[model samples]
Target chain A: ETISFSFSEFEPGNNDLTLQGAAIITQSGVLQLTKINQNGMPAWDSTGRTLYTKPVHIWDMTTGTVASFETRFSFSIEQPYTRPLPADGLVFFMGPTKSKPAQGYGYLGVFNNSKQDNSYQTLAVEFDTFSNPWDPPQVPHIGIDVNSIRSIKTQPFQLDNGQVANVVIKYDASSKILLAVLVYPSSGAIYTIAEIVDVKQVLPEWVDVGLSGATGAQRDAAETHDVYSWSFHASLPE
Target chain B: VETISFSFSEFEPGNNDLTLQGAAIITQSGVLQLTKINQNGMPAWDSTGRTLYTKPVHIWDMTTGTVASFETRFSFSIEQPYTRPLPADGLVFFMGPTKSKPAQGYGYLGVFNNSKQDNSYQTLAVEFDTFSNPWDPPQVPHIGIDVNSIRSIKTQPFQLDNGQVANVVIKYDASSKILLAVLVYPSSGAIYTIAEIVDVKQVLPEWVDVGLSGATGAQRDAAETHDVYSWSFHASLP
Candidate 1:
């Protein structure tokens, strides 16, 4: 039995994620896995960075389960911070592996090749910039995907290319629903996506939760995905 | 003239990522202590007790295809309660896909995950194994390498100074595809070449993530911990 705890105001740090207590930081962190490179960033970063929380929760599906989690953070999609280029967006995901995908791109650094169709089990909310065939007509939008790139729902909203956009992700496990709500600082615009998801149904009861973002090679604008702050909590129904 | 230059020290007491679960924090003593033998709770890893760390990000530039070469050196000791007898398993230095949980087994060296597809996920590992499996021909502690599967590609008999720090050095030559390893008993200056020059391209990508792993089955009480003195990576190679 794990006790419920919470962390807020994730202080900012340089390249060093020393204090985050996250896992699966590849490239600069681990040696064998693919790193962020000139080709572009993966689900973690274009320059090749990844961040995730350490505590893993094991949920039992056989019984009716209930839980909740929430986080707030600001992100930027420019050349490392500020530049002309803006590439693929970010995805806060729940999946089987913290490893980079077959090759991060349209897959959002989550899965690659037939693995996307086969063994990979993931539930993601993508804030996409560069549109691909797999996504809906919304050029820049927020959408929900279950194991497949084809989003179940896509709603378009525009945020400044070089400005920070505040985000709030809340998952109400009792109702099996997930919400991605965004607030644009450059402009006062609020965008939200509410989708039905049961983490127990898509991935194992225990999973590694993290952030991954990437930029592609096809004339892609190399960018950086930075998180200003994050807070998370998981617990049963009160 | 190509030159080799690098520096890394992961075992310092200040280095945080020595936890049993995913993300780790700096332990007070600065030494990684994994004595959670037989508890099998919290960060419980499957049927076998495991302590594994996969680098969260990519490290080298495989995409550029510059024929990267590297050397990793580290040390470890197996501690067992006098009441429990001998240790069951040992530690390993590995490079593979990020965010993976290999199959749970004693003496697996943490290279085998649930994805049994050989050569499909791209992994290469050098194990400083202390335990002998039922299937193994001999019951002596040894040094070995695994390309994809848990079964060692090449295993050679070796010895470690009980309760003392053993020295290990592994080097990879990208051009020759040679993976060489040397082990030393620091006090006696005795050394052994347990791993032959093995081809690495067949089992892994040029730019892969790397880390350490150790496991013990239900039958033993030994707990293993790695105090990496230095772990440096360099593209330096002629």
Candidate 2:
């Protein structure tokens, strides 16, 4: 069986989505995963998630085979001009159906604030804008995270304020390879990152797929994250 | 089984499945040219319009009163030969009861005119508008979902006339009655999306024509050419 769905845009009365914490469908019809206060400033130390309501079939227990999946989404991060830098970031993640938004800024609302644990059962392609103590350096980057907030592999990537970014992530079950592509339309810059990981070994057969974003506590270290569009498809072996 | 699928990598001559009108023609390079800019480097006060349409398809079954779910993706670009302060008109993806004549003048985009602004007209359009009319929202280069009337039910700001090839995806789900439109700027990775709930069966006939429409204004500087590089569509009955 194959699972496929596309959200060209998000609407107010649409029921295919589940929002947690500060996540909301803005009046402009995009998925906003962080809160903006009355002063038009991003709220401090915030975390939120917007998830597709339906669970995806990642693998078949009977056949002992995993599914190949492709997901594409576009997003933008806006930081106030007065701010010298942006904090936190967003992620396209798959995890257990019971997953909830996490509290810390660096967790990206995908994992709890506690130390890294294998029991969390999560896989994520993160667009990390801020450098944490565990991160590589003080630069924006993309990373592949499995069961931990600390990424297993990371690639440095630059992001402009208020500039839109398009991302595509594909996982091939046969090759056990996960590929990530990010494109900046305005600058015509493209970044491709890949990692070798068998998702079936990290996540359950039935998992939820969605986006998560967070904001840090620094006075100049906050930004709003918005997702413009998203689509996903999975093909299982016959 | 009711299923339909068609893909045109680039519209070429002898493709009877597509019908071109007015200034629309097949370019020597196999692209669908929807509008012709003035030649000889001379611009005059001329109002031009064009349309490229497909034959009527069974969008709904009268016996069961069930509408088919459909999705379409197309790549298009707009070029201005003369430097213009602003581009005139734009393009629209429309479904209507017949292959109606293209509308004259700017802002109409071959969809409607002052005479056909009433609810008596039955047409559903996803418009990528460059010139904003008084009736439109106070935003240029936007996407709108129009039902019957030129005034859209939903509108969002999007950059469409950047002189680069862009892609758009329009999807309608029969069960949920959700109409979604997504615009992608491949070079800049910018994406704008908007969606609304619309029951096509209530506004269109069981058999409907689907196509692209574009128009230019009387101003010489606003003269622009529209082109379609590729297109694909699929529909299936539940």
Segments of candidate 1 deviating more than 4 angstroms = A1-238, B1-26, B34-66, B81-86, B102-105, B114-117, B220-230, B235-238
Lowest-scoring 10 consecutive residues by lDDT in candidate 1 chain A? Answer: A16-25
Put down candidate 1 lDDT per residue, A164-210, tens digits, no spaces. Answer: 67666766565465666666646544455565676766766666666
Best by TM-score: 2
| Candidate 1 local lDDT, residue A122 | 74
Tell me the tens digit of each residue's lDDT in model 1 across B1-238: 3444434444444434332432222245444433232344222222232233433333334455555566666655554333454565666777777656644555565567542448785877787776667545474577886778667766768666666666666766565454666666555433445333445545666445566666654453344433344444444533
Alpha-carbon shift of residue B50 in model 2 (angstroms): 3.3
lDDT for residue B99 in candidate 2, whole number 0-100: 63
* Candidate 2: segments with Cα more than 4 A from true spot: A1-238, B40-47, B81-85, B115-117
- Each model's C-alpha lDDT? 0.55, 0.78
* Candidate 2 residue lDDT tens string, A41-157: 887678889888889889977889899888999899887847656778999999889677876588888877636777878899999988888889946889999988788878788
Distance from true location, Cα of A119 in model 1, Å: 59
List, residue by residue over B136-220, the lDDT tens digit for candidate 2: 8878778998998778887878755457888877877686576777777766666565666788888878777788877766576
TM-score of chain A of 1: 0.74
State the DockQ, from 0 to 1, for candidate 1.
0.01
